[PDB]
Amino acid sequence: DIVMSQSPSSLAVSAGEKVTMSCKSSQSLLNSRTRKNYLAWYQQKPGQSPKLLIYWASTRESGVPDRFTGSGSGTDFTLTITSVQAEDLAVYYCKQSYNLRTFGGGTKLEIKRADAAPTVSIFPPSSEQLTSGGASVVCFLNNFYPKDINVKWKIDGSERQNGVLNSWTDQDSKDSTYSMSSTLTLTKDEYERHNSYTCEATHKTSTSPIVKSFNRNEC
């Protein structure tokens, strides 16, 4: 069967710059009769379904920006994006249609941008969760860059790491930032045995941690 190899695994550029990515098949996708190369390129934005961008190696499907152009013939193909836009954050896949079908491993395209500090907000456990005997303290870290960032929870001034679940979002398609979610989970009794709750975020953007917190008895 036809194997499709894509290079590089991932790319990264600032908005406006140009990128190219490679796709090679184990055999020629050029049909001697139709004079067409059965090679297509797809774009898959996060949370989305793949979208056909180009077919027959060079033809752009109606609706696709001129900034996307495909070249190559035979075994070696290339996808070029003239002026990368922020919405282009995606994994691009080539697919051969010569004999049956097969996808390449894909090329991920990340967007570089200027540094951004996270906007931090902390939320106490809801009254509803408490009745179920549990107690989650949530902390959202929104729109920061780069993705590297550390979160430290503190309860009554002392650090804590037991029941912490972290989750990073894909890069934002509008502003190229990242967001993260941190959840400190306790039982109802523990949460109520302590009084101060803190979420601390350390990011390249400052040597001083962005600090957010609350007191169980605030008013």
Binding site: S49, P125, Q129, V138, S179
Partner: protein, 222 residues
Amino acid sequence: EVKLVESGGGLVQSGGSLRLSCATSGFTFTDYYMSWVRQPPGKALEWLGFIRNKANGYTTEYSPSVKGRFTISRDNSQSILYLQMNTLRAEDSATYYCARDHDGYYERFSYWGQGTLVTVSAAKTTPPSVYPLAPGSAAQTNSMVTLGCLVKGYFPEPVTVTWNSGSLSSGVHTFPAVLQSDLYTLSSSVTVPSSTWPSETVTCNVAHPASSTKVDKKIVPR
């Protein structure tokens, strides 16, 4: 207009059998080849096989990894496409997409469904508990406010989150589920103008297909 909708995904044990569907409309079904493609979480697309059009005898072709294990059929009167999966395994856990395909000879446009997620494991199906995240009794910070929803303790994925039935999209961050034991927990945040909340209604709508559950939780100030 041309719609491809997959269903039948969900939970299943090893060795088990599952049948997926892909209902269509907006085009004359009989004239097209149909393909099935899958994708394990965070991995590459993978073609599974296709079923040809009428003019080609509705015959089939599959990829090795599914040889003699998966079957593709089509209901030409209902315009539905199926994928019979048998003797399932962990590596089969993935999102399954149907797509309209063809001889690449006709000048066509491509369409894919949103996909259905198949999870393979022996864990039990569990509905989520949906909790509102309102700001602490403490003081605010600026003319904008961040609210949230903690979708906790469900299995398996996925769970879909919208705010005010999708009318509140801009300014919404839904975080990927995190697996802790046999349960998934995720959260979603929405930032809106202080002039909007609590002035108006802000509700997160969470759906859990595996358990056929839907929860609408209103965020009201503590």
